[PDB]
Design a protein around this ligand. Sequence first.
Ligand code: ADP
Length: 794
Amino acid sequence: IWAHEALRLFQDRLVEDEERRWTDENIDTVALKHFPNIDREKAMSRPILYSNWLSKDYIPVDQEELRDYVKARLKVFYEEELDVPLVLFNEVLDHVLRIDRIFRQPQGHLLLIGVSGAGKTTLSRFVAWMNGLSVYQIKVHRKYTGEDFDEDLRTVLRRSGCKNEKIAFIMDESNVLDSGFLERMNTLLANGEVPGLFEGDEYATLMTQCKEGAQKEGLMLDSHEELYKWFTSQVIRNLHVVFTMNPSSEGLKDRAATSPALFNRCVLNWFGDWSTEALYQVGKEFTSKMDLEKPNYIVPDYMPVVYDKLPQPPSHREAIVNSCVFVHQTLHQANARLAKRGGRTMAITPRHYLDFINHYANLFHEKRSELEEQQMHLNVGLRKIKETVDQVEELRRKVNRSTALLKSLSAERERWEKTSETFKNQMSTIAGDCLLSAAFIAYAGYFDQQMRQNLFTTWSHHLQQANIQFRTDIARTEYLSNADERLRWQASSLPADDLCTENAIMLKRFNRYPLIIDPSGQATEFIMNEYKDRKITRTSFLDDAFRKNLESALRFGNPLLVQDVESYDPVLNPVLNREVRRTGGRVLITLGDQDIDLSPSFVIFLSTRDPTVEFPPDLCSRVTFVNFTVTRSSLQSQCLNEVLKAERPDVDEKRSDLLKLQGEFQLRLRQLEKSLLQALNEVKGRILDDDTIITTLENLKREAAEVTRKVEETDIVMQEVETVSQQYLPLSTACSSIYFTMESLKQIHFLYQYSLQFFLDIYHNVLYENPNLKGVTDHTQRLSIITKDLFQVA
Ligand SMILES: Nc1ncnc2c1ncn2[C@@H]1O[C@H](COP(=O)(O)OP(=O)(O)O)[C@@H](O)[C@H]1O
């Protein structure tokens, strides 16, 4: 008991792990120095836990028994008030025990300092429900004022003191908009009452209520002073205040002077971020369902160490989970390097790790399912072809059709064998591929292409050193997307470059409702065009009708696009966190005070036109960043297209239609391929069924005709077009260099802020509004004039 109390009073507030280790060592050292004959293992066993849930007394418990009890209680909790599944690991057990300990005291006030999204609020809600404490959380909005806060304080105090109901009052660093909020908290936490809160008639009514309360307890109180004293005692008894903060320096010392009652009346619990331990246990527990079993795994000699207690035989599953925690950890080094050289780094909350693991699981399940269907179709096709070949050989011992089909079916068999051999390697490397894919989807949405590539390279190097099999020399934007949806996106006016394709990939496979950083309106229109069928609605936080449209979009299931997110309304805080209640057969979600029946089809997108905006970490944990930056290659391609449209319009129009037709030929070739395979697998006629042989030779004729046409157009027409365009490419290079010099100009001077539209106007003026070009018809002189005038006008 002595050691348990020493740990709860000397190590909860510690920040670094070194200090925690020092405290844990010196507890044992002191106990051994004073007690020289005690048995260490019966008193100093490492998982010192104490709880009174299992029994009627505050006895020690065991991790496994407590884990089972907590699991059962969470199962009841979900059906009771909050259907958000959790993962249980050692830290969650310790923290729920600490929070219950504080909740049991009369004036039990808590201060949970830890990264956003780490589970502080939901753990407090869980344990408060366990102990029967009604939870109260103020609903902050755009017009939330100090008077609104005082009204909530009056209500919570009236319910605590009068009517004698226990309350857990949960507050956040974001809820304290003004300093008057912190002054009222200071007095409430230090004295159990706010003098001057109740004034005029309110006070009288309060006194009336207080009198009633005494009549409930049988006390005979009549004076307005003793009634107030009794009310203060009741509030000291039935009211617990919980505070959550981010572990930021210069914010704790600020609060140590702004409201010192947070350091003398509140128990400080330093949650911090999930430790390497916690990441390891959540990784393994969530990925347990996934098939990460590799019997022929080879352990490398110099494996890298991330989790210290990694089993000395690392199985495949352990290696995968170790790589998962490595992927999460590398984002912190990336942010540190970014902040050291420049800045604009966001916060890597544990909700990022939850998204990464969930993406890994879903993607592994999906890609495993697709490979199996394709391989089964290929195998049955090969079996049917072998059957018909043997049948024809027997019949030879009428036949012209057989040779005609065999003419193409021979190469069909060859490439089928090739694909079967290749895709069996894909099955081997599915784990590493899906790991890298989900990691990129979850952790690179905000970074630019150089940073995304560096992250991918580091993850690949780690997977290589850990002997994990991932298919290299491939590009992610193909592994995560098919050509059909790529065509559908491009029909939605999506720019045609890798960054935009993968941004749309993120916008399709999203767990946390995305936040779009588009300095232009391209992503905004792209979203509008895609969700136009589903009747997406455009609303803004600045709009006063935002709440009306939000409620409508939630209760009817229509997608919603919101701009100007710098003015984020905390009304969305539940919706982003998906705090849903599956009660009465329906899903209910709470906005402010009103509860509404959510529809499963509801989708919300948030967006902003400012790329140089810093968001608070509470928002940074609830959204998926999708940053639509501009790349060198995309700018070069747009500039080359523009100069070809202007200088040689005929070639541009030719190139435009030719490229448009090339896309349709690959589409139709894939469709004929699918129809061929489906027809082979569905029918039960090798050579006897003419009704099935008339639909397959014509298919080969269409295939041959279309391949001939495309090899004709993509080689002859595209050659001359490419030769025409390869002379304007120095202009595009020198045109992107100046734009990126302009963008870099903001570093030396804050006033030098230039947008892409500005340089585009420069370039359009140089092309279509150039007086020095009036009269010149030769293309070489025109190009020289264009480049000189671009430099000068810029
Ligand atoms: N240990 C955990 N296991 C699973 N989900 C978690 C865990 N911790 C936090 N979450 C997720 O975080 C969301 C709410 O986080 P919250 O507790 O509000 O963050 P904070 O602790 O900063 O208040 C929930 O939707 C939940 O899914």
